[PDB]
Design a protein around this ligand. Structure first.
Ligand SMILES: CN(Cc1cnc2nc(N)nc(N)c2n1)c1ccc(C(=O)N[C@@H](CCC(=O)O)C(=O)O)cc1
Length: 1195
């Protein structure tokens, strides 16, 4: 292999510690890794090998099933070939679990030493060191050897996932055409992308479906030896935590599903704002959508907050459950008439610490994951059983042929069909239109099968489809398509396909990589690509669909005149083209109508601390975080002081031979338990409140920024980029970041609690702990700066796998036509076994960190266990029991604390990306203090004076020195060349970018007044209409100033009234999304209604009606002239008859006012560009317009 893998040769002492992985980090610490630096997978894990294992068992299972006449199931096959070897990892699960229940038994015997401490008894001390020794080995088993096991049970999921993806692909080639009607690309790619992805998860915990239950028995049996019948009270309070956890699971999932409606409703409404942001600004409707989204967000936070506070009680249960389970036991243990003893309780405290995770976390997660992963296997089992293409098998012969696309009541798609063609014979075909024209050709391939009659084909086949097809690779490779690079034949076809020049001139030659999903090439090349691919095959048979040759062009000739008519003419070619004049090339022409063969004759028949503090201080006043810090510490100090109190009671009890007053010692105990639950609850609710309240504040500050952003911003950023921040980023900020942040903080205090009791009880342990702190923080940087790349490579290598499946599935007939399936099969393995290289690093790099990180806290357990026995003279039974019963938890929590530190610091990028918009550069204020007088714009005088306009500041001048007088109520036609002037005159007049010079409206300086003063008083009919998702009333008047009778008047005048009055809600009918229930012309009629309602003294037409059919265009042109006769009107137009009667016309070119006069006075100057443009009409209509103009102005 090109990339050797050290795991093939590592000695066991190396691949237990992942010592073999160190060379990857020395690279990644110097350089950002690349896909060439990753190790190749083991021979055991190559996709080709896994597929041809499991496919064999699945084949046997299908064969067995039909012999039994009992339904096959895939879940038997993926067992019968992993049962052999996944159960081996089950054996090593025992010693992993047995460690968790043997440390507490030796933990008793070390504490039992201090209860019986004799300074001079060397034998007891040496005996205690026996128990202390095995306590580290039970710890090192659980900390070090566990990570080799846990790597292998993740690998058993990778091996299964790639075996499945390979069988899905092996099937997805051979799906019958029938099954291709049932399925769709999105469904089969969902198997690869969504469903088989579950098989990494199922295999991790799967052993807990037995080892977990067995362990819960084991801990109960031990405790019954240790603390008697009270253990049943403890275990019961643990077991009844299963249904409560399940109740929460259902309940917050229920609220989650509810929020998804408003999240979807917000985002889709947000999508309209970002798409239409130009049109929304022009109408000054920014206040409306501000209110509309604001009410959707309030209806969402009222449920996100309610669910999040519900998750607060959940996390408080994970925190506080151990303290409650302990409390009810020891309370019961004393109330049943017994006395606490430090050994007997720190054994029992530790055992609940072991079994709690298994019963509440791993065993329920195992049941959940296996439940949903078997949903996946049942979907895949449904897919594998789809019906599949039957075996097909210089000459083609077809007789009496009749077939259907499916067995149905529709007529046969081919009828009576028969023909024969032989070497030297060319066929051509004429047939249906607007239908599966290819149907005959597909029949010759066998993508449709005869219902009656016969087809036989004896040569190797080549084929082309009206849809071009190209897949992952170089353009050359698509042409070579698995054959050798025979340069002369290649050059001959590359010449004959008129490809050479265009390929080198436009796509840098055949070495160019074809972009993903084929995005690189132009269609006319991609068309030629198919023919070039086809003719390169040197097959015998050439079934040629039309290569989009319907354009009259030299290529559309040369491909036929040379390559077909001279080179290919001897080959068995069957040709379709709209260029039917070429049919004279045929030896025989098949002519069909509606799928009936009718004629057969020849032609002769014719992130950093700055980000965190902005996120936090947006959430609450800094004093609230001071109060939060007390709740964090007070929750934890209650948590530790509960267990210190249990140890203190043991010291008092063990100083007695009188009796302790249980009404006191249980009194304070229950206070500390109730305190730790209450502060455990109150912490979790408070953090969720403060952080969710931040997300509400960041959104509302950020959305108001988007509206005030200038149109330049939405030109600079594509709408997908902007909306994504409202979808994902301001999603995380309340869906998941508060939950992850609390989970980190909650556990981080747990770890600090462990080192605190350890250092408080054994004071010197701070001295070696400082190296451990110094070692850890060095290692986190050394790791994460390379782990971050492996996370990135794993994602970047994912999407080609699906891209190849999608691309292949879009082109199946072309693949099968050459029978070249195993070529596109092996190319999937080269994609699959490249993601497995990036995934194999994802597993083992996380395991490398977790091994070294657990060496730190396995050393800590060593330091406390031996440190206590070295320092035994000073210690006491209780305090050692405290220190150890805590320290033995540490290697559980510390991994999770550090894991969540990477999720938060990673997810914090969504905070910085949102904040990047929170201060985006604003437009000028919507409403300056110098509001225009109540003598509002009234005359409609508009002055342009030296107007110079650029879209970007310092960009090219799109208008230069533009200076014009438009008198009151004048009608002005505006004309320009393609791209010259255009709507840019409007963008200035609405100040969508800042004009230099001055524009006056009734001698009001437009740059002084607020944009909502300016944009309300003028009005526009924009180039494309938009109907927003909402009521017809809101599409007419979202401020609801007008009566519906007046809305009926407006809808009447655009003649939409009765169509809208027929709607089931009349004015209050909510439109379909983007108003798809109305055609483009109807939407423009709505745009006219908006102006008709507002009755502005200035109207602007943005060339829009050129998109509209003449009958509605006439109605628009009519109603404008009748309703806005007193208005000043600007008419950007192309079709000069729309403006030939304008009191003046402006002609703009190159951003300059080339003509400005009465149109005929321009036509009177035959040198004028307006006269030239009128003559460039090229028809006597120029005279009719000239006479029309003349009459208007001579009158
Ligand atoms: C103490 N603690 C906090 C925590 C978080 N969520 C919970 N959720 C439940 N239902 N119950 C809990 N006790 C619980 N506890 C922990 C402890 C260990 C691991 C943990 O080790 N998780 C591993 C298990 C594998 C391993 O690393 O050993 C994983 O799959 O990520 C997580 C959280």
């Amino acid at each position: 292999e090109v990339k050797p893998n050290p795991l093939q040769d590592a000695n066991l002492c190396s691949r237990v510690f992942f010592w073999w992985l160190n060379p990857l980090f020395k690279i990644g610490h110097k350089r950002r890794l690349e896909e060439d630096d990753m190790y190749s997978v083991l021979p055991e894990d190559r996709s080709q090998h896994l597929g041809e294992e499991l496919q064999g068992f699945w084949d046997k299972e299908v064969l067995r099933a039909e012999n039994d006449a009992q339904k096959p199931s895939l879940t038997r096959a993926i067992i019968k070939c992993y049962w052999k070897s996944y159960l081996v990892l089950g054996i090593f699960t025992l010693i992993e679990e047995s460690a968790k229940v043997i440390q507490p038994i030796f933990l008793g015997k070390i504490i039992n030493y201090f209860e019986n401490y004799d300074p001079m008894d060397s034998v007891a001390l040496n005996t205690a060191y026996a128990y202390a020794t095995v306590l580290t080995f039970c710890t090192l088993i659980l900390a070090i050897l566990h990570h080799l096991y846990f790597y292998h049970v993740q690998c058993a999921g990778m091996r299964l996932r790639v075996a499945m993806c390979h069988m899905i692909y092996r099937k997805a080639l051979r799906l019958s055409n029938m099954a291709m009607g049932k399925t769709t690309t999105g469904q089969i790619v969902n198997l690869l992308s969504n469903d088989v992805n579950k098989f990494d998860q199922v295999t991790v915990f799967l052993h807990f479906l037995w080892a977990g239950p067995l362990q819960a028995i084991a801990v109960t049996a031990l405790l019954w030896m240790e603390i008697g019948i009270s253990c049943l009270a403890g275990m019961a309070v643990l077991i009844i935590l299963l249904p409560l956890q399940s109740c929460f699971g259902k309940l917050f999932s229920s609220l989650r599903s509810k929020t998804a409606t408003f999240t979807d409703a917000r985002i889709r409404t947000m999508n309209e704002v970002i798409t239409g942001i130009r049109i929304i600004k022009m109408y000054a409707w920014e206040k409306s959508f501000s209110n509309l989204i604001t009410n959707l967000r309030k209806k969402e936070i009222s449920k996100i907050l309610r669910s999040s506070c519900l998750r607060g009680m959940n996390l408080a249960s994970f925190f506080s459950a151990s303290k409650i389970i302990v409390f009810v036991t020891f309370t019961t243990y004393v109330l049943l008439g017994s006395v606490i003893t430090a050994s007997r309780v720190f054994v029992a405290v530790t055992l609940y610490g072991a079994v709690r995770l298994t019963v509440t976390l791993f065993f329920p997660s195992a049941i959940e994951r296996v439940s949903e992963a078997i949903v996946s296997i049942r979907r895949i089992q449904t897919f594998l059983l789809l019906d599949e293409i039957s075996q097909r098998n210089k000459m083609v012969h077809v007789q009496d042929f009749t077939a259907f696309w499916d067995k149905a009541s529709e007529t046969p798609t081919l009828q009576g069909l028969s023909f024969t063609v032989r070497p030297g014979e060319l066929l051509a075909v004429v047939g249906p239109v607007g239908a599966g024209k290819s149907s005959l050709l597909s029949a010759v391939l066998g993508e449709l099968a005869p219902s009656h009659g016969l087809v036989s084909v004896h040569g190797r086949i080549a084929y082309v489809s009206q849809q071009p097809w190209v897949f992952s690779g170089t353009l050359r490779s698509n042409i070579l398509f698995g054959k050798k690079y025979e340069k002369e034949r290649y050059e001959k076809v590359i010449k004959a396909c008129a490809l050479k020049k265009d390929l080198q001139l436009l796509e840098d030659g055949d070495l160019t990589v074809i972009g993903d999903r084929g995005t690189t090439l132009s269609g006319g090349q991609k068309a030629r690509v198919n023919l070039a691919r086809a003719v390169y095959q040197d097959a015998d048979i050439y079934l040629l669909d039309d290569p989009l040759s319907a354009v009259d062009a030299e290529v559309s000739r040369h491909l036929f005149e040379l390559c077909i008519c001279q080179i290919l003419h001897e080959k068995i070619t069957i040709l379709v083209t709209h260029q039917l004049q070429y049919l004279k090339a045929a030896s025989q022409i098949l002519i069909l109508k509606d799928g009936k063969m009718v004629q057969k004759g020849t032609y002769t028949e014719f992130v950093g601390f700055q980000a965190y503090k902005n996120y936090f201080r947006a959430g609450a006043h800094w004093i609230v975080f001071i109060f939060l810090i007390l709740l964090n510490t007070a929750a934890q100090v209650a948590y530790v002081l509960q267990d210190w109190w249990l140890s203190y009671w043991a010291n008092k009890q063990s100083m007695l031979n009188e009796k302790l007053d249980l009404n006191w010692y249980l009194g304070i105990y229950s206070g500390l338990t109730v305190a730790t639950v209450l502060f455990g609850i109150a912490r979790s609710l408070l953090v969720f409140y403060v952080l969710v309240n931040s997300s509400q504040t960041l959104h509302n500050k950020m959305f108001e920024s988007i509206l005030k952003a200038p149109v330049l911003f939405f030109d600079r950023n594509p709408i997908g980029r902007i909306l994504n921040r409202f979808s994902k980023d301001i999603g995380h900020l309340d869906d998941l970041l508060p939950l992850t942040f609390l989970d980190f903080i909650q556990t981080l205090l747990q770890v600090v609690g462990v080192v605190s009791v350890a250092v408080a009880v054994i004071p010197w342990i701070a001295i070696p702990l400082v190296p451990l702190g110094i070692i850890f923080i060095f290692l986190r940087r050394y790791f994460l700066e390379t782990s971050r790349d492996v996370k990135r490579l794993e994602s970047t290598t994912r999407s080609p796998v699906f891209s190849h499946l999608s691309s292949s599935l879009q082109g199946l007939w072309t693949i099968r036509a050459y029978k070249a399936e195993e070529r596109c099969q092996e190319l999937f393995d080269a994609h699959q076994d490249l993601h497995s290289e990036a995934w194999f690093l994802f597993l083992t790099t996380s395991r490398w960190f977790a091994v070294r990180l657990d060496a730190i806290c396995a050393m800590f357990v060593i330091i406390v266990a031996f440190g206590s026995l070295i320092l035994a003279k000073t210690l006491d039974a209780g305090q050692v029991g405290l220190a150890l019963s805590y320290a033995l938890t540490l290697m559980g929590m510390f991994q999770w604390c550090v894991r969540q530190s990477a999720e938060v610091e990673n997810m914090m990028i969504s905070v910085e990306r949102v904040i990047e918009y929170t201060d985006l550069e604003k437009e000028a204020p919507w409403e300056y203090q110098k509001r225009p007088p109540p003598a509002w714009p009234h005359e409609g005088v508009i002055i342009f004076d030296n107007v110079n306009f650029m879209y970007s500041p310092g960009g090219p001048l799109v208008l230069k020195h533009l200076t014009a007088l438009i008198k009151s109520q004048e009608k002005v036609g505006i004309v320009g060349r393609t791209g010259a002037g255009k709507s840019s005159l409007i963008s200035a007049l609405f100040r969508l970018s800042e004009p230099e010079g001055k524009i006056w409206i009734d001698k009001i300086l437009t740059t002084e007044i607020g944009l909502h003063d300016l944009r309300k008083k003028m009005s526009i009919i924009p180039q494309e209409p938009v109907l927003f998702t909402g009521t017809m009333r809101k599409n007419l008047d979202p401020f609801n100033e007008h009566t519906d009778e007046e809305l009926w008047n407006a809808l009447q005048e655009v003649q939409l009234k009765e169509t809208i009055e027929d709607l089931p809600g009349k004015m209050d009918t909510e439109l379909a999304e983007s108003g798809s229930n109305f055609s483009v012309g109807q939407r423009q009629l709505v745009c006219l209604a908006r102006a008709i309602l507002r009755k502005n003294q200035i109207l602007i037409i943005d060339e829009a009606t050129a998109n509209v059919d003449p009958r509605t265009d006439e109605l628009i042109q009519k109603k404008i002239r009748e309703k806005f006769a007193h208005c000043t009107v600007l008419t950007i137009a192309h079709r000069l008859n729309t403006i030939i009667d304008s009191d003046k016309i402006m002609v703009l070119d190159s951003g300059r006012l080339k003509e400005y006069d009465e149109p005929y006075v321009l036509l009177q100057n035959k040198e004028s560009l307006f006269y030239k443009m009128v003559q460039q009409l090229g028809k006597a209509e120029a005279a009719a317009l000239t006479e029309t103009a003349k009459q208007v102005y001579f009158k």
